[PDB]
From TrEMBL, chain A:
The chain holds residues 24 to 197 of 584 of the full protein. Required for activation of most nif operons, which are directly involved in nitrogen fixation. This is Nif-specific regulatory protein. Interacts with sigma-54. It comes from Rhodopseudomonas palustris. It comes from the Bacteria.
């Protein structure tokens, strides 16, 4: 059952967020889990300073100082929309979508032959949007992953990540 | 269908935990949801200060100042066990569980006819148990499978509560 696997995934994610470790290590383990467990590929936690300048960017396999490698994979128009609107964004086919340039689709693995869907949700801290959590899926003869379920699940993960981020920011700032 | 309901519950719990509010208001909304939505009844959050102080106790239907009434319901020895052990305590039958006095069992509603199950779970912050999350009910014949699933669910909720509590304390 997809719900059984998703219940185990959020159970494991809850453990990860409570384990004391460097924020980037926590966020890395989370998106690693979204991929290996729920087949959500290229999961990226993008965090921004208050002036919209990148703070940290971490995706699957993050090592120290690799932030740019993951930021070079984000479709900035779509991410800008999510940040500016505080509403999730979905594209069934990023190769044929207004908010995705030719470069956006290439970076996300999309071609004229391979249909790639994008799903991004906002990360919020006290009504302010501080970043994005985004994934993509390749539409082949995989399971029938409903985009609305992904949006719900990622919105839940984003909420918890925002608390983890506020925790780290409150700590460092004192 | 079991996991769908739980998924919705943890989804809603996540929004409650991340909505700005009084700490006590947050914890009361969580246990209110656990009871009304997931039928995990009589939920109590008890947080210890570093000297072991009770410091905050909030259960279903909490009103300002009512902490001591919820703590009166909790079997302190079992709480002592969970804190030192960082492991769930499942008291399938509190009248026969060795960590429960007769007074502890009766306070949970146990009688010579009625019987009561108790499940307690550690709330950890930085490898240290700062409190417990517990539920209780009239005993039923749940499968060991769903008993474990309920324990897994409350462990998850307690993990997230700990993150919320640490945030409030800093």
């Amino acid at each position: 059952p997809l719900s059984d696997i998703a219940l185990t995934g959020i159970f494991e994610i809850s453990k990860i967020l409570t384990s004391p470790a460097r924020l980037e290590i926590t966020l890395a383990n989370v998106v690693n889990l979204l991929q290996s467990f729920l087949q959500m590929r290229n999961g990226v936690v993008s965090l921004l300073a208050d002036d919209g300048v990148p703070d940290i960017t971490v995706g699957v396999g993050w090592n120290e100082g690799s932030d740019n490698r993951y930021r070079a994979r984000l479709p900035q128009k779509a991410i800008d929309q999510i940040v500016a609107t505080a509403v999730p964004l979905v594209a069934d086919n990023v190769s044929a979508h207004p908010m995705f340039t030719a470069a956006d689709a290439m970076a996300l693995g999309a071609t004229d032959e391979i249909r790639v869907s994008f799903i991004g949700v906002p990360i919020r801290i006290d009504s302010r949007v501080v970043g994005t959590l985004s994934i993509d899926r390749v539409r082949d003869g995989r399971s029938h992953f409903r985009m609305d379920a992904d949006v719900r699940f990622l919105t839940m993960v984003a909420n918890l990540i925002g608390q983890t981020v506020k925790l780290h920011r409150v700590v460092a700032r004192d």
